[model samples]
Target: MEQEKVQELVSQMTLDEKIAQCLQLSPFLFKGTNKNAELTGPLLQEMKLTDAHTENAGSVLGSSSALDMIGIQEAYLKTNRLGIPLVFMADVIHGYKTVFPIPLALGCSFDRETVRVMAEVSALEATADGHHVTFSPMLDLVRDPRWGRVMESTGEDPFLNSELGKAMVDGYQGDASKLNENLEQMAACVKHFAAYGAAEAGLEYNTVNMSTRELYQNYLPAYNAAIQAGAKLVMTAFNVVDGIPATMNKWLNRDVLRGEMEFDGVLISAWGAVAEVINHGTARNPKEAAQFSMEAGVDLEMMTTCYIHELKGLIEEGKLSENLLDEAVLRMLNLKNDLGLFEDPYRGLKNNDRTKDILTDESRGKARAAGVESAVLLENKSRLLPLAKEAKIALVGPLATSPDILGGWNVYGEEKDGINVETGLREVFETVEVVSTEYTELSEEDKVAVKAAVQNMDVVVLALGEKNEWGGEAGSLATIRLPEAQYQLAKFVQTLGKPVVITLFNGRPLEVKELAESSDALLELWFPGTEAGRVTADLLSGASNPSGKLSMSFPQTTGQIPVYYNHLRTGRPQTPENKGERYVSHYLDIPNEPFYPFGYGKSYSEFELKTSSLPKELNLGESLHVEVTIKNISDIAGKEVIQVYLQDVTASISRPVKELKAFEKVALQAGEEKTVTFELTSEAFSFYNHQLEKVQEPGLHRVFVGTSSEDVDVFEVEVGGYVL
Candidate 1:
């Protein structure tokens, strides 16, 4: 379908139908009678919608029943006279059926090919399940650990987030030229546009108030990267930008998003975001919310009657132009057409079912490998990891066998399908004792069971951290410490004098100051989706080595909230060399350091890093290459994630102390050495100026290369010229 044909189809639709096309409702409308039946007829009264309001409802954001698929699409086809072919969209965030690690865990992998393959597998599985669009590649740059949705974001660095964002989009949509030609690929929707993760006080949906310079410098680039990767849709965030809600912020959606970003695609709102504009005090009623959203260039409204109920009336009353409806509807139609929905609404659904492409062995295998790659080893005191398979182990905790291991928003994956820790461990270790504790809290009765279970065991493995339900939307924590109950459990177990390996099944970066200190080994297996159990077991037993690094920094304590690398340089900054000075931005209680910095992780095998010296001068349009030799010094074979951080000693504007400019993950056998080369252009030293323009100022710059943010070797070079 060409642009003219989609426009023609939109012109043929009635005013009511055009409004309906912009409205994305739940599946109950087409499902006829569902769990929502008691509320009203097809959610009409419950949602404050009329019969005609749902007649041509264009899309669905639904239950797992949406995966039943063709039946739902068939329902819409029977009712609509024009047969617009309902487009199905859902939160296929990480992986659909073969759920891999959470986005935060994926960020830790730092492997583009792994991210790409996981996304492609996600697309294939979801597309097989009849999903048309995925609300994914959540590009929100997060420095705050308290935001529960941090699990959805890639990480705190704009560069890391930007790189992974493009990989996700490319993986989800495939090649842009042949996107519509392939039914296995689904349209990608970049979400929560414009700095959603930097919610104030590390709270979800909290006010995000930052200057345009800060916004452009840090938060907005990942979204631009996704857009550049050919994402077809942009979903609005629930929070406000400046003073107005993002759903109604014309400057954000129109001038910045559609105008500057050149996103001439469908703009969809987050769930009930347009309606919640009334609660934000930005709009008084549905009419005002609907009017504001339309004016701001929102192409579609999700799970709200604002657009369906008020668009036609608002247009007739001369408040909104009829062309607005035509434009939005045309974009929606274009998306559907680009999806090849006009030719085959039930693309592949007729030929495929649950047993076909969805959750196949190959996808599950890729997910398992991804989960292994994403699991970060935070501590390995006295070489406690690579536990012998002959050793008897006691896996005790709420997460020990309890199946919520498939992440909080498992999104399309069933808990039963997830391989549990006990299941994974039993496969590797000869003798395994399984004990369970109450989730979030250690019950007295369960503690006794754990005590008895680990008494005869060779080693006690304490599985702890935030619950599977603690991360995602509205999932914010005021204090990021391990639960008091879990802390006591660890302390009590430590009194027994048995070696301990603590594996955390969490979403966000928690304050693990003591857990890492006391435990023999600390593994950050952050919600490793379907293969959580198997991946954890493999790393613990030496079948797989931990290569993943931290994308977000872990605070020493909750008081040190919102800690990350790449923070702007401060005049009175506290430094290791300048410690014990009270006037130099020093804290009275805690140090200005995270428990674990970004790019921080441990491997079973140790590596020796050697870097070539840098030249004195760097020039414009010229690439400076640095060769680095990394040798596996230990007897164990493993993968190492080498990170490169850049710091501009002086710039036109204040710059970050250090930014992660590039990273590479290398696999090396025992005693193997490999030299990896990194090239840095003048662009690597560029910074946003007072005018929010990304420009490079001639100055001395420092380049650091190492395994993590804090542990690095620095070399100095002068950039010779200014760049516009």
Candidate 2:
């Protein structure tokens, strides 16, 4: 449909029809198991939508399956005078049918191509199921692991998050202008806009208070990147920003996002957020909430009746313009048109052969490769990994055989299809012993059985970590550590003096200082989805080398709640000389450092870096070049992630000690040496000033290039200043 046709359709819509277009309801509201069972639930009653309004709903949420979508569209068109097809949307976060690693784990790959491939596969599977939109590429940047939603984020870096967000958007909606023409594409909706990740006390749906400079510098970039990549929709956050709820904050939605950022895409509220504005104490009732939301530019009210119930009254009362309602309806209609639903309401629906499209062998293979790349080799003390193929292995712990390896937000993922660690290990070794304990303190009888089983084993593989529900939306944790039972189990295993290898399956980073000390080797396998078993076996058997790096910092303890590598430098910074000083900005009990810093990972092989060449100064309009030689010093072939960090020494506003500017991941053959060159443009030296303007000032700059943030070779250079 053309712009003229969309406008003409909106002009033809009655006031009641226009109000219905802004409301999105769950399928159960109209299409219950039986006709009498429909609209009987409390949720449907609270929605306040009559039978007439339900028939003309513009969209449906959480509805999949071609038969269901086709049935709903056919039913809706029969009653809907305008004949606008109902658009189906779902939370297709990571993967639809063939579940891939969680977003946090995918970020560890640092491979944009893999992220793109994962999104493309998700799109393919989702479109086959009749889904037209996916609320994915969650671009929230998180520093607090206690916030359960951190698993949905990329990591704790703006640049990395932006890059990954753009890649996902590109993969989901290929050629945004031609969305209707592409069968494999589904509209991508970048979510929880405007700092929902910075929830206070790391609690879900809490307040977010931060300076505008901080908001622009850190949280806003990822969303901007996603929109610039051509995401079709933006979802509002559930929390308040500067005491104003983001769902109704006009300055944020209109002035900043739509105005400054130039994001002309449709803005939808987070699930039931508009109605909850009354709960947030911003509105007196649902009527006030509807007026504020419409004026604030929220085009769609998801899973709520605030807009449907009050918009007509507000417009008639002259408090809300009919034009605002029409504008909202137009946007919704344009989206359906953009999906080519007008041409054929069942756009991507296939009546038969859905089984052939979903969870295919090709999709599973891609998931296996992604799972392998997402596992971080956190510790390999004295080369304990790549166990001998003939070695006897004892696999123990609750997660060892549990099928809950599929992480959160996997609404459609089948846990029964996942491979457990015990199953994966048996495929490689003939005689692998398994003792699946409850992972709490070992009972005397249980301890005796495990001790006898592991007596003849060469290595003890302890698979442990949080359950699938531990880290996701509303999954915040107060103590970011392994369960006491798991800790005691590790202690008991360590007492045997055998080589104990800990394979951790978690969503958020855990406080593992003691866990790291008790094990000979620790592998952070962050809830590898369906391919958990196969990939873990391959890494252990040396068929595949560990290549993943940490995207978020693993804090030493929960007290260091907001620990990250790119924190701004302070005037009275703590150092080795001021270790125990009373007034210094340092923790008295623990060192002010992460248990594992960002970009930290280990492999079976060793890699060495040398500074082959460096530039003394960088001019205003020129790019800086630094060449470093990287060599796989060990006999094993492996992959290495080379990170280059930059620091602005004397900026108007304080800068972080080191900020990741560029990185490259390359595979090195055994004893292979290669020269890696990194170029830095003047843009790398820019920082958000106190006025919230990005500026590049003349000053001394520091550059560090190495494997991780803590382990790097430093060099100094002057930018737009006298060379020394």
Candidate 3:
């Protein structure tokens, strides 16, 4: 229906009815000794709101442990005066019934197709369970590691975040034909609006302070990318941007999101975020909070009664406008029409017998494949992986037995349903030895178990790190170190004199200088979701080659807390060769380099970059092809990401040492050679100048290609006003 029609419907409604449409009560509100009687009973007899019985008869339900689709459907049918169906929204972040890797782990895969498949599978699971919308594809670009919710985001790169952001939208919305075909294709919601992840000291809902340039340049790309992908809904953030909480910031809600980006979706408030604005000191009370949210573009105040409880009284007192209320309700009704909700009240509530297809064996296999691809090969000094098929291996750690260590925000992921490491490794290797370490302490029996296995095994695989809940919401760590007991166990295992293969199951990047230096091989498995066991086994046994690269920088120490690839260079660009480093921006106690640089990863085989070249002249609308010959120099096959970085020697504004423009991942057999190439256009050359105009300035440009950032081959391209 159109906005005019929606207004006509609203104008016909009584004041109580209009207020009821805006208010959504929790699931707790509907439960009683007799649910049927409570739903159909007089409003004031049940609750305090006298009109809630007459005109306002709609309510929402929270999650239930024994959550049945039939029960939920019956409840919605019984409660509404106008048969207004409840919009069931759930926290379907990484996965639904069959859990995949956490969002942070999936982001490291750099394979948008896999992320799409994961989302598709998750949608199938969620829709099967009677959910209509998911609060997901969190587009926050976080720089701090201490924030627990960072696990729910695609790490701190604006470009990569945007790339994955669009992929998620494509997965959820499908194509135009698919969207029309399946009512189960739930609407994708990009959240939490603005930058919620850049909280101070990695604290949740802490003060965020940055300039407008920073907001436009870095913080807003992924959210905009979500809009560009046709996302139908957006959720507001919990924190304030530029001293104004996002739920009521007119500039962000109306100006940037609505006007500039042209987002026409139902802008929903984060849970209790509108009511919480009073604590933010922006609103004097709950009444003022409701007015501010309505004035801004918040169509729905989720999980709170601030809008419905106080807005009507505020409007009667002339403190709030009826136009604001009409506008908000109009947007909500528009979404219902787009969803075809009015055409068929229970479109998604089909009685299909395909619930078994939700989290099938095939779905689990696909998730494990994604998990294997997302495992970054951090270190392999002597090609320690791909252990001999007959070699005995001892798997030691607290996580070796528990399947729930796969990380957080997994909806409907039960610990009982997961595959443990013991089972996974046993299936992969025939002539292998297995050992178990206690969760709290490694007993003498555990040492005996490790000793006997190590005496016969060729390698010791140690799974060590934080548990699943250790790095999620309210689980932020002040010091990024291995748990004390685990570190002691690792040290004891190191004394065994066996070649130790380390598998780190962590949410955020740990400061692993000592661990990296001591281990012969390191695999940052990153809480590998549901298939944690199977993927780890495949990577260890060469069934799958590790291809993932670091999405976030791992600092050498906690002192380098906010380190990343792109930052302004200080006056002194110090190198290892620099003799005197007095009064420089250098850490006196630790090295300046990260433990592993960004885009850094390893393979079983090495690829030698033998050549590098660029096309003659840089001109507008002309293609510049950079090519390089890479030869596989090891005995085994592997995949490598051939990265291309660009540098502006002198720009109107200072440029970083390098910026990633293009990259290609290539798979090669031993001794095989291939010419990998990348084509660039003027858009790739454009940068925000000192004037902040995104333009391609006539200047000198340098291109570098290599395995990683530090090891690159360089070349230059210069251009005048004319073509060559």
**Mind giving the per-residue lDDT tens digits that candidate 2 earns over 1-724?**
7789889999998898888888888776765322234444765667566877887787888874666676777777777787888888989998988899999999998878789989999999998887899998899889999999999998999888998899899888989988888867899999888899899888999889999899988899899989888899999999898899999999999998889888876788999999999999999999999999999999989988888889888999999999888878888888898999888787756445455688998999998898888899988888888888888998888777888888899988898888889889999877799988774456877788778878979899988988878779899898898789888888888998899899989899999988899999999889778888988898888888999999999998999889999997677788888767788888878888898999999999889988766778776656778787899999999988888999988877878999888877878999999987887877788878898788778879999999988889999988774422
Worst 10 residues of 3 by lDDT: 57-66
CA lDDT of each prediction against the hidden true structure: 0.85, 0.86, 0.76
Candidate 1: residue 115 Cα off by (Å): 1.2
Rank order by lDDT, top first?
Answer: 2, 1, 3
**TM-score to native of every candidate shown:** 0.96, 0.96, 0.92
Off by over 4 Å in 1: 31-42, 66-68, 351-354, 443-448, 722-724
How far off is residue 372 in model 1, in Å? 0.9
Clashing pairs in 2: 440-485
Better of 1 and 3 by TM-score: 1
Residue pairs in clash, model 1: none
lDDT of 1 at 333: 90
